[PDB]
């Protein structure tokens, strides 16, 4: 499975989402079952490191990928599942230079993925909650535009949720024992107690995550601390980064290689390369159509 590095699967150009033919021929060739893990988030938040580490790459921490966008893929063998492939998706360029296909790229990632990894800096903020809410419903509207006819049946389709918090080497709070990353999640996910229309327009995203993301793991990561940029524009190695950061991101990878399920369609048919090509074309066609059937909401 040659793939030395990542490759764009869906490119964002002129506000126009175009699926990659070169990427589709690759997917087609892979007959084995797939575990799709989408590392989504804002640009320049350290997503690439999770990708390289997940792809098994030893030297995978770049330092400034200076310029002078869409969904990139990386198909490697699954390091804990022989006969299974690991497809890695990355939402490139989200909010970089900034119709704004950010939500759509976000949605396709969640759609195509078997596991959903949201990557953000600092403490959990409303802005993240709102778009997480927005994508949940957006994915509902797109998936529904593919169903043979014009709700515990949509929750079964949704991927697992993983939140990776970055530069949040802070994460210091407790009751009597220090909070775990997981406990921090539920905490920052606690609903506001108030019969108001400000707390209402605050608890909706929380309520949405409560229903649509049943399995939820959280990861807090330390600030990556390393030797100075010895001649700029390079790619460091683990032995040159904060040992804690390396161990944290490894413990993350381990959770992925073990807990992440094989991508399945409706009826429970495992998804393989050619099956993912179909899903990429279907979903790109459902979006690029500018159609979208207006059915009832799902919140
Ligand atoms: N703030 C922050 N940047 C990181 C971290 N890990 C890697 N980076 C940097 O963030 C950039 C990665 O961009 P990305 O893949 O999220 O679009 C690279 O320039 C890399 O040097 C991290 O944990 N926190």
Our mutation pick for probing the ligand 1 site, out of 8, 49, 164, 244, counting the most ligand atoms within 8 A of Cβ, is 49
Task: Please report, for the domain that includes residue 271, its CATH number.
Answer: 3.40.50.300
Distance CA(64)–CA(40), nearest Å, equals 19
> What residues contact 195, with CB distance under 8 A and at least 6 apart?
none
The residue whose CA has the least distance to atom 8 of ligand 1 is 46
Ligand 1 atom closest to residue 51's alpha carbon, by position in its atom list: 15
Contact 69, 96 (CB under 8 A): yes
DSSP state, 20? Answer: -
Q: Is 156 exposed, middle or buried (0-12, 13-18, 19+ CB in 10 A)?
A: exposed
Angle CA 252–254–256, to nearest 5: 75
* DSSP class of 268: S
| Residues 6+ away with beta carbon under 8 Å from 290 | none
Q: Is 184 in the pocket of ligand 1 (CB under 6 A)?
A: no
How many domains does one find in the chain?
Answer: 1
**Contact status, residue 219 vs residue 184, Cβ threshold 8 Å:** no
Which bin fits 209, alpha (ψ -120 to 50), beta or left (φ > 0)?
A: alpha
Residue 114 marked as a ligand binder: no
The span from the CA of 7 to the CA of 75, in Å, is 9
* 290 annotated to a ligand binding site: no
Helix, strand or coil for residue 29?
helix
**Which tokens is 100 given?**
């704004």
Bridge partners (DSSP) listed for residue 126: none
**Can you read off the two tokens belonging to residue 231?**
């001649």
Q: Would you say the CB of residue 167 lies under 6 angstroms from ligand 1?
A: yes
Is 238 within any annotated ligand binding site?
Answer: no
Q: CB of 224 closer than 6 A to ligand 1?
A: yes
Q: Closest Cα to atom 21, ligand 1: which residue?
A: 63
167 beta partners: none
CA 198 to chain centre: 29
267 is an annotated ligand-binding site residue = no
67-70: long-range pairs with CB below 8 Å, 24+ = 69/11, 69/12, 69/93, 69/96, 70/8, 70/9, 70/10, 70/11, 70/12, 70/17, 70/105
Distance 90 CA to ligand 1 centre (A): 13
DSSP 160-196: EEEEEEES------BSSSBPPHHHHHHHHTPPP--SS
User: Measured between alpha carbons, how far is 43 from 147 in angstroms, rounded to an integer?
Assistant: 33
CB-ligand 1 contact for 46 (6 Å cutoff): yes
Which structural domain range is residue 193 located in? Answer: 1-299
| Structure tokens, 241 | 């980064």
Whether residue 64 has its Cβ less than 6 Å from ligand 1: yes
Rounded CA gap, 208 and 140, in Å? 12
209: closest CA among 275, 259, 158? 158
Q: How far away, in angstroms, is 45 Cα from ligand 1 center?
A: 4
If we measure between CA atoms, which residue out of 292, 280, 293 comes closest to residue 21? 280
């Amino acid at each position: 499975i040659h793939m030395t590095g990542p490759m764009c699967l869906i490119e964002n150009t002129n506000g126009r989402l175009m699926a990659n033919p070169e990427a589709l021929k690759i997917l087609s060739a892979i007959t084995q079952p797939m575990v799709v893990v989408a590392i989504v988030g804002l640009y320049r938040t350290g997503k690439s490191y999770l990708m390289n580490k997940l792809a098994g790459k030893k030297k995978g921490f770049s330092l400034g990928s200076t310029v002078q966008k869409g969904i990139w893929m990386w198909c490697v063998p699954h390091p804990k599942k022989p006969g299974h492939i690991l497809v890695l998706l990355d939402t490139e360029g989200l909010g970089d230079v900034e119709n704004q296909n950010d939500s759509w790229i976000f949605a396709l990632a969640v759609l195509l993925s078997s596991t959903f990894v949201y990557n953000s800096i600092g403490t959990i903020n409303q802005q993240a909650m709102d778009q997480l809410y927005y994508v949940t419903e957006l994915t509902h509207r797109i998936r529904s535009k593919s169903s043979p006819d014009e709700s515990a049946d949509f929750v079964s389709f949704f991927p697992d949720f993983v939140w990776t918090l970055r530069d949040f080497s802070l994460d210091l709070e407790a009751d009597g024992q220090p909070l775990t990353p997981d406990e921090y999640l539920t905490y920052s996910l606690k609903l506001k107690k108030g019969t108001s229309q400000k707390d209402e327009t605050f608890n909706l995203p929380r309520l949405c995550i409560r229903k649509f993301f049943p399995k939820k793991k959280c990861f807090v990561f330390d600030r990556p601390v390393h030797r100075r940029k010895l001649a700029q524009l390079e790619k460091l190695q683990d032995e040159e980064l904060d040992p804690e950061f390396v161990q944290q991101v490894a413990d993350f990878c381990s959770y992925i290689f073990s807990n992440s399920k094989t991508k399945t369609l409706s009826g429970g048919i495992q998804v393989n390369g050619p099956r993912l090509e179909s899903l990429v074309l279907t979903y790109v066609n459902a979006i690029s159509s500018g159609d979208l059937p207006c059915m009832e909401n799902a919140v």
